[PDB]
Symmetry: D2
Subunit: 364 residues, 4 copies
Amino acid sequence: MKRHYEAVVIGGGIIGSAIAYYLAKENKNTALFESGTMGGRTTSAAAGMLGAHAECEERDAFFDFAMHSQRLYKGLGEELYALSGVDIRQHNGGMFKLAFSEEDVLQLRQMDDLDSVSWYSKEEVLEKEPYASGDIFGASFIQDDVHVEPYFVCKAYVKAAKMLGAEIFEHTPVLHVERDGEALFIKTPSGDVWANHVVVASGVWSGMFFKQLGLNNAFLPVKGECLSVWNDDIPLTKTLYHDHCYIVPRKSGRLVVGATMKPGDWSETPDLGGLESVMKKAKTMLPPIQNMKVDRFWAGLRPGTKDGKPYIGRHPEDSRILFAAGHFRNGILLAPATGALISDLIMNKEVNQDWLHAFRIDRK
Amino acid sequence: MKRHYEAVVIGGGIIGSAIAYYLAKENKNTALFESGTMGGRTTSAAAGMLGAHAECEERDAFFDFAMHSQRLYKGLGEELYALSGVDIRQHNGGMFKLAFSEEDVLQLRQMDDLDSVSWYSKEEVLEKEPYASGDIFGASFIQDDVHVEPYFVCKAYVKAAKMLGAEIFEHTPVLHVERDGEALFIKTPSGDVWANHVVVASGVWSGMFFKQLGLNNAFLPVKGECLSVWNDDIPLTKTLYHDHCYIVPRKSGRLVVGATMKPGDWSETPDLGGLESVMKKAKTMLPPIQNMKVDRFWAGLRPGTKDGKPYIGRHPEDSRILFAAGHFRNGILLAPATGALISDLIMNKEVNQDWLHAFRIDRK
Amino acid sequence: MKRHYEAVVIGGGIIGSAIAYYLAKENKNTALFESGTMGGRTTSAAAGMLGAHAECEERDAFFDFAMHSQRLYKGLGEELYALSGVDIRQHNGGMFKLAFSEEDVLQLRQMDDLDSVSWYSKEEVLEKEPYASGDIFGASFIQDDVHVEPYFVCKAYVKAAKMLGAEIFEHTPVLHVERDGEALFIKTPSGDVWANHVVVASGVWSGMFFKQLGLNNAFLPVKGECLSVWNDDIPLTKTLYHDHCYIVPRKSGRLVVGATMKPGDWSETPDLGGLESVMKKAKTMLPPIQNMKVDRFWAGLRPGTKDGKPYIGRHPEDSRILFAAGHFRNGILLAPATGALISDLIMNKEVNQDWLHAFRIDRK
Amino acid sequence: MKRHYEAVVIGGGIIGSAIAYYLAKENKNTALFESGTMGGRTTSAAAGMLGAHAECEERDAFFDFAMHSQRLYKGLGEELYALSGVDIRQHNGGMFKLAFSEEDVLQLRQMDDLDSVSWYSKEEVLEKEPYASGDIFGASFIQDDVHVEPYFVCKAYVKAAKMLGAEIFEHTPVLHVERDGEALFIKTPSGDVWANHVVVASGVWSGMFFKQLGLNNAFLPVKGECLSVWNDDIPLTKTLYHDHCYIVPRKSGRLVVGATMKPGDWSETPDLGGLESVMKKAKTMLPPIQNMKVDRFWAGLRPGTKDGKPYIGRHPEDSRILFAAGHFRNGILLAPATGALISDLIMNKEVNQDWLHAFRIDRK
Ligand SMILES: Cc1cc2nc3c(=O)[nH]c(=O)nc-3n(C[C@H](O)[C@H](O)[C@H](O)COP(=O)(O)OP(=O)(O)OC[C@H]3O[C@@H](n4cnc5c(N)ncnc54)[C@H](O)[C@@H]3O)c2cc1C
Ligand SMILES: Cc1cc2nc3c(=O)[nH]c(=O)nc-3n(C[C@H](O)[C@H](O)[C@H](O)COP(=O)(O)OP(=O)(O)OC[C@H]3O[C@@H](n4cnc5c(N)ncnc54)[C@H](O)[C@@H]3O)c2cc1C
Ligand SMILES: Cc1cc2nc3c(=O)[nH]c(=O)nc-3n(C[C@H](O)[C@H](O)[C@H](O)COP(=O)(O)OP(=O)(O)OC[C@H]3O[C@@H](n4cnc5c(N)ncnc54)[C@H](O)[C@@H]3O)c2cc1C
Ligand SMILES: Cc1cc2nc3c(=O)[nH]c(=O)nc-3n(C[C@H](O)[C@H](O)[C@H](O)COP(=O)(O)OP(=O)(O)OC[C@H]3O[C@@H](n4cnc5c(N)ncnc54)[C@H](O)[C@@H]3O)c2cc1C
């Protein structure tokens, strides 16, 4: 572990790994410190949907950033594979956002004006996915809202970043960041290091560093539990989505099913009531799932911020300190764009002023 | 693997292991052939309750045999431990059979005349187990219906049997039993062996051997799925039982929760609908369980016979061939008595004629 | 489960699965019976190398069949994916068959005349794979001996077959095959069925059927133990191979390492001595593997015939009965060719007489 | 989570848990904060030997404390069970400290004068444990150095403490300890709390708190890797021990084997080289272990201080702050004594001055 680095990333989830990759891409000597193992936290719990259309409510900067990031995923798998040998496991079936009421229809048709987004009647959906619930009023088909396995997108970014020279340190938690002196000083139980730039990408745990650097930005965890089953009996190519819940078909034959919303819960293992709730919900969307064998069950903590938006930018009073935390349920989707934006800010390049203002650290 | 044995046991579940132990106890040179690993089938799925009072419906021979077997468990743990070093993990808290309706009360009070069985009012139950559902009309407390961990009762029997000279062969399925000649001849993929006595203890798979020996006795599997959670927050000493479902507190801090009933289902892994059903049921009995972290989920196949009773006895036309299969939901409870009865039949000792007639192979 | 099927396949490993796929593709009404789960035995333990160049010591019929099957894999993944949505996970890095002595060199140079096969010097190998043992004398590069994940090739075949009309029955062990009427009679615990063609694809367990049908073809298990580690630090694209041992890098970042050779051992879980031996061997081939985190360990039973060659063909005295079992170390590579050959035989199509003869059931 | 507590414990390993138990027993309003789950780190990796006779090379204060703690274990299991319903799984077989040379003999004979400790000749050892290595020169039999399952001793302590009123908070990492008011101020992501006494029991991670409070006591992790196997064939009642390595037979039939010694390594999963080394060592001690089925593998971080001794006592400049961390290879054995000592100190009771001095926080 060197004594000085041009840039240091605190956090090895998918956000940190992405940032480390782009920085090393810029031939910037960087190091990444992760408390445990790469992507072993919230990143490993994620379904992996590139759900840009799950947050188009109000076509603001937030949505544009998301669409932009979704486009960045084009060729990313091929790119990262060449350097890491790790497959991100991308599935291009697309997504069916189901409607079970007029209200659902009204919400979903709000985006018919967008391209690649087309409305399907009840009969048209069942024509493509015969086993989807028969209680649907139809569904919005989002061709581009595909999915990848998050853990491997993270591992691919890291391996690639290592092959480009990035130095990665697992089992190395950062205890403190001192902005004193002319260069930043970070302290870890395995030694202290100097850097010209420090990026905070510690997910829901990033609050510690905000406070340390004189900022009140708070993070609240919103626990989500899920399960997986083996689908060896029916065809299912498209992801089924409804009210933030989903059934995504993996290329392994498994179905990743999920999500509960437990605000303020910091525990990372599923409780019985939560799992029962997920099973019940899944059944209303895909009735046959009740006959599928259960594989695994798990949970993760979504990084919730006051306005549900992430903090991606510089420290108000110190351009050497950046932040990239608070991706509630779009972290996998936004990794590329987030990594690119942070990298451009450090490289002092020009960046979209709307996105920069949208995710600024000192928001109202 | 010797060429000849005085007695051979086909099946290494808890029934077979028990039989092998008692036979070796009689200093009878015996061998046991198990398809996979000792106790790796239905025995490993069992809750482990010594539920003699779950089948007192009609105080017939069946119930007496059960009570008798329950008594045999006295000192068994200590006995088997001395020889194997394996702890059966016996928990003596006892059992509360809950009532949620007048009908439940009527069914349960039918046994008030029995000793160690006492009725508890709603308030008396909650006094002992404050977290049991408040919707109960009360419960029948069965002090003796305690529990053990089945897998280890099986392992203890086997180890003990080995220390006494029994030869155990895992990964050795028996393909056929030839009653031709003056001695039985069993064929396995690892070699053939001769024996003076053959005991069929292959659980729900015993049907193959019945047919082979010219008998129509059929076995139907009744799949049961369960789960376990960690109870780190509330006191729970007594087993909670209702309508064949249960919540048994293990000495490790886990709660074994369960059972669905899937007749004709031969699969041994839990399906989503079954697990949801078990969770739902458990919650009505112990509301706080919904907040407990899930540990594992599994399933097993109960050996169902036409009359729900096991076959424990000699082949009608050949006293060299015995059977011990069909313990629907009392296999752990009846292991000792079953093992002792089969051992006595082979040793040509005198045995209870009522039990012998109750479990005969040629029942109506 | 119907009462009649044009073709019945016994055994659901990769061989039985491939067979069912091609039969279904031929629009033949077929059923497959697996005593446990699809691909749950030896198939799930295999490394998945398409090792055709491991059988070229003598360019006979066997080598041709092997090369033929390897070509059949061209595009197989795409084809199966389209129908199953299951990715077989093919890795095209190729293989380095290392040499640690002059004898190794002489033997490996013997295939220099083969296409897509060329010799690499010590320094040419290290140029491609820098972390390979510095003790090598060089290596033969086999571009086509790539690898796949066997379990998924099996699930892909099964799912595809289902989508084409094949009826798959897991947890349905076949007990006996009767040939007395004008059609075969298969008995299972879940009922009996008639068929015009029966194919025995029960791997190392196929012996009971041979014997049941008047054949004495023997099978001996040759247990192979393995383990996997996470390769998060060094590059490795080519499979490393030496003396039947290997280190294969999966697209997930794991290295599948191993194999012990234990004849007569039917146990399917690794013992301490075997794993220690695999670890020791791996270190001689790839030194850095010593510092990699261990992931999993497991074992499988290679189906060994008297000559290490499979039995693929019709029953000498009954052309309605076929066998496809005994693929020692090449069951994955030979799956496509074995499947197509058995299918063609059932369809009475014309087949290569050299291959048909090499895999005869009645080999002297 | 309340706003005030008389005593706060930081860290929920076996040390913090024991401390919380004794404090609760003293009817002190206490809270415990664990960043993950109770006993989830180093405590869960320990073999659980109550190895007091591993510190008798010099019969100083340390050895006395060790012997004292070992006595405290007398009846501890019963006591904790009554309140928690959790079995600590104590095995009283005792321990054989083997000798493989004359030097070993000379060193081990040095404790012949100790009670419940006696020398056994080569043939006397084999008389008790026939399968022990035939290469031994004999062994010292230590009747009292028995073993327990650490995780469960920890869960028992925690549960008992809860039943006595202690408030346990998992997934609640303590970020900072402030000492400025008249009471301590502990900050966590889930809120801040005041306390009259704070105890740092964060194992190898305790260093950040020492430094936070003006102390430079350093901690270095010494990673230990282990594995378990199933002993289903040979007898083994005594724990086998040699050069800090061991083979301990659990009441479940498993043998817990191991330990590597890797200073400075913070990773908690075993690597290939470490496990191979543990397997090699185990075989020299108990040859038959080579054929036993491997169960699991894992690792833990021994908390190493500059002198291999723990820091148990008050903060030199603040008697409201206490520390109990740095139990190198004796954290399980010393749990009862450490807990009682810290509790007595908080209750201002009288304590052994020799022990208090040996574990001083400001050791030269
Ligand atoms: C059930 C569920 C389903 C989801 N599905 C999707 C989905 O389909 N699509 C999508 O786009 N998003 C999804 N998400 C959200 C997505 O998982 C997250 O936004 C994303 O994982 C956040 O990544 P991160 O790198 O910011 O944080 P994390 O992945 O949580 O990692 C932060 C990292 O920093 C480390 N760290 C913390 N403190 C320190 C320290 N002091 N020093 C060093 N390292 C530290 C951690 O150990 C950790 O590795 C889902 C989330 C949940 C819970
Ligand atoms: C969810 C559930 C909960 C239960 N709870 C309880 C409870 O609380 N109390 C209680 O008393 N009972 C309980 N039971 C029932 C109890 O598990 C069974 O009655 C008992 O396990 C049956 O034991 P067995 O030895 O007859 O059969 P098994 O345990 O099923 O074993 C039969 C054995 O024979 C082997 N075998 C089969 N064919 C061959 C062959 N050809 N050659 C060699 N070996 C062969 C198998 O591989 C297997 O090891 C429960 C069952 C279930 C499913
Ligand atoms: C460590 C190891 C590494 C290997 N690596 C490679 C490699 O790199 N490349 C390669 O080409 N090969 C490899 N092999 C070999 C390959 O795994 C096998 O040849 C292949 O899996 C055999 O497939 P199968 O379908 O014949 O048998 P199996 O996969 O063993 O399955 C036979 C099936 O039939 C079922 N069955 C048995 N009896 C009955 C019954 N009565 N009724 C119904 N079903 C029954 C079983 O339950 C099972 O599912 C390896 C093997 C091992 C052990
Ligand atoms: C392979 C191996 C074998 C061993 N065998 C034995 C043996 O036979 N006998 C014996 O006596 N000892 C043995 N030991 C040693 C023993 O395991 C340890 O001494 C003991 O577990 C230490 O306990 P602890 O409570 O101090 O620390 P830990 O168990 O490591 O726990 C410290 C706890 O504090 C938490 N924590 C850390 N930072 C914070 C924070 N900021 N806020 C809140 N919580 C925090 C952690 O998450 C953790 O739960 C062994 C160790 C190893 C590695």
